[PDB]
Amino acid sequence: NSNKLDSKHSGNYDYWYRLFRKSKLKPFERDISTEIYQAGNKPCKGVKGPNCYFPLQSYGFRPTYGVGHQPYRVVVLSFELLHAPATVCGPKKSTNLVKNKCVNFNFNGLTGTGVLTKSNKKFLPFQQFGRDIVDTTDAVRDPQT
Amino acid sequence: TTTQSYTNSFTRGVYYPDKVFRSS
Amino acid sequence: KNIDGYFKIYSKHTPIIGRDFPQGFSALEPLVDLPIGINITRFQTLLALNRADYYVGYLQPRTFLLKYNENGTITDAVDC
Numbered sequence: 001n002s003n004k005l006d007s008k009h010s011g012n013y014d015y016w017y018r019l020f021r022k023s024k025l026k027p028f029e030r031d032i033s034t035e036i037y038q039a040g041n042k043p044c045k046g047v048k049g050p051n052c053y054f055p056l057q058s059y060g061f062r063p064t065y066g067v068g069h070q071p072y073r074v075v076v077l078s079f080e081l082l083h084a085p086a087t088v089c090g091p092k093k094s095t096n097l098v099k100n101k102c103v104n105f106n107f108n109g110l111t112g113t114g115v116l117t118k119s120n121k122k123f124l125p126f127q128q129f130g131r132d133i134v135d136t137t138d139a140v141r142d143p144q145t
Numbered sequence: 146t147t148t149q150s151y152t153n154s155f156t157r158g159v160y161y162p163d164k165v166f167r168s169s
Numbered sequence: 170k171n172i173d174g175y176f177k178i179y180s181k182h183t184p185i186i187g188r189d190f191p192q193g194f195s196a197l198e199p200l201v202d203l204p205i206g207i208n209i210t211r212f213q214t215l216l217a218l219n220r221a222d223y224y225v226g227y228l229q230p231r232t233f234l235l236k237y238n239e240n241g242t243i244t245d246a247v248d249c
């Protein structure tokens with residue numbers, strides 16, 4: 001509910017909304033247009049009152065209405081959870097290290113078990129993982145250290 | 146303009162397939 | 170390369186020797202990786218302004234053996 005930013009003294013008629021459209025609205029469609037709705041058979045766009053109505057009306061907001069008339073602030077989120085290269089993801093949580101101890105590690109999605117400690121490798125800057133001759137994960141670079 | 150000369154690549158154009166450290 | 174999108178670029182800068190295209194081994198290191206995911210069938214180059222280059226090759230899926238240095242770099246590779 002936003003009754004502070006959309007309400008001041010002496011009223012406010014800033015917002016607009018359309019009760020009159022030629023048809024229904026297709027999914028995710030914007031129809032910003034000022035076309036007077038036809039009534040009967042008149043092509044009237046000069047007549048303003050009867051049988052020729054403006055397509056959009058106002059959302060005149062004041063600090064004193066009922067709850068059903070308050071200027072609610074609505075934000076809708078649409079996601080695309082399909083087979084596609086992921087771009088936006090959640091806040092993955094990081095933790096401590098605790099070296100020289102058997103610890104379950106989940107390094108940047110590489111999950112396993114073992115004991116981790118300092119090394120004297122020669123990792124190149126682009127390098128992220130480590131392995132051996134038999135292709136088993138040997139060394140991992142700390143993503144936050 | 147440009148020329149369409151043909152040469153031999155010899156041994157060249159080798160990149161790291163992955164980012165996994167390997168030694169010996 | 171554009172394998173499953175995920176555009177790949179690898180670069181390496183060598184000051185070269187008296188010749189132009191050498192034989193001495195030179196590894197190629199990645200720089201960036203981002204999901205382009207668009208059709209890529211044509212390729213063109215851009216030039217500069219001013220008042221023996223652009224050697225272009227193509228890749229095929231082959232099997233390779235690479236000798237990894239003790240430091241992790243690449244010292245010698247052999248085609249199969």
Ligand SMILES: *[C@@H]1O[C@H](CO)[C@@H](O)[C@H](O)[C@H]1NC(C)=O
Pocket residue numbers: 143144145
């Ligand atoms: C990780 O981010 C924190 C928060 O800004 C910063 O203090 C720290 O130096 C960063 N470390 C690395 C390795 O980026």
Ligand SMILES: *[C@@H]1O[C@H](CO)[C@@H](O)[C@H](O)[C@H]1NC(C)=O
Pocket residue numbers: 151152153
């Ligand atoms: C490829 O180059 C080698 C020698 O540089 C030779 O096989 C021939 O000149 C070229 N092959 C062509 C142009 O089909």
Ligand SMILES: *[C@@H]1O[C@H](CO)[C@@H](O)[C@H](O)[C@H]1NC(C)=O
Pocket residue numbers: 206207208210
């Ligand atoms: C473009 O790529 C898509 C999949 O990435 C493929 O289905 C389509 O046939 C391609 N169109 C071309 C190569 O003209």
